[PDB]
Amino acid sequence: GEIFFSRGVILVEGDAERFIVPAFAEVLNIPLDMLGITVCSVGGTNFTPYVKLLGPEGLNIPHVILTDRDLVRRRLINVLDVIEGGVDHEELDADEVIKLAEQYGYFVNENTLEPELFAGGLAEDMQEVIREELPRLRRETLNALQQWVDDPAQIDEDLLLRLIERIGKGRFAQALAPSVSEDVCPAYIRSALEHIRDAIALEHHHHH
Numbered sequence: 001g002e003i004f005f006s007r008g009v010i011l012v013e014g015d016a017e018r019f020i021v022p023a024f025a026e027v028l029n030i031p032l033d034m035l036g037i038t039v040c041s042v043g044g045t046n047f048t049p050y051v052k053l054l055g056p057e058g059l060n061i062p063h064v065i066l067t068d069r070d071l072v073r074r075r076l077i078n079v080l081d082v083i084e085g086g087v088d089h090e091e092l093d094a095d096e097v098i099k100l101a102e103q104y105g106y107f108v109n110e111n112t113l114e115p116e117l118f119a120g121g122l123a124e125d126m127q128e129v130i131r132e133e134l135p136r137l138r139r140e141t142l143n144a145l146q147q148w149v150d151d152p153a154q155i156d157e158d159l160l161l162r163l164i165e166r167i168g169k170g171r172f173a174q175a176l177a178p179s180v181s182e183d184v185c186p187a188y189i190r191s192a193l194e195h196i197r198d199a200i201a202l203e204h205h206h207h208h
């Protein structure tokens with residue numbers, strides 16, 4: 001509904017990106033709402049129906065994709081067949097499919113979002129959210145958490161994501177969003193934000 005009213009669309013996998021990506025946009029001084037850009041969670045990893053809607057045979061709306069490497073090869077061939085149809089992409093290896101897809105604003109993260117943020121400078125703020133959302137954690141789990149903060153290179157990823165999923169991925173990301181800053185922005189998110197910003201700004205510039 002908002003898609004039909006938007007100048008651009010940022011496609012993301014789930015609720016964590018749905019709230020974290022606009023928070024990074026604001027500290028990058030890229031004002032998504034003022035620019036008419038909507039963030040849309042596809043609720044999974046199937047981006048193809050949305051690329052069909054926004055591609056040249058659909059509404060022809062500038063859009064970007066943020067997705068996790070984890071089979072990302074097939075996921076990206078599925079959208080490249082739409083946005084670059086009908087060219088064969090079957091003979092490309094994964095890294096070739098990935099570097100082609102960046103041309104269309106589709107960007108892959110080599111990690112998953114929350115562990116990257118924990119290791120990449122948001123360790124202590126994520127601890128405070130977890131302890132506020134889960135205030136009766138057993139002492140063993142508190143000790144492991146303090147230990148990850150003291151050495152974000154040593155983290156139990158399964159347990160971290162277990163705690164975040166227990167809080168709720170969307171709820172957790174909203175509570176974390178006020179802490180994000182420009183210098184801890186993951187590269188794939190900065191790339192996607194700049195790509196969609198550039199496309200919308202180029203539209204305005206072409207009025208002369």
Ligand SMILES: [Mg+2]
Pocket residue numbers: 013017066067068109113
């Ligand atoms: Mg992601």
Ligand SMILES: [Pt+2]
Pocket residue numbers: 133134135136137
């Ligand atoms: Pt609890």
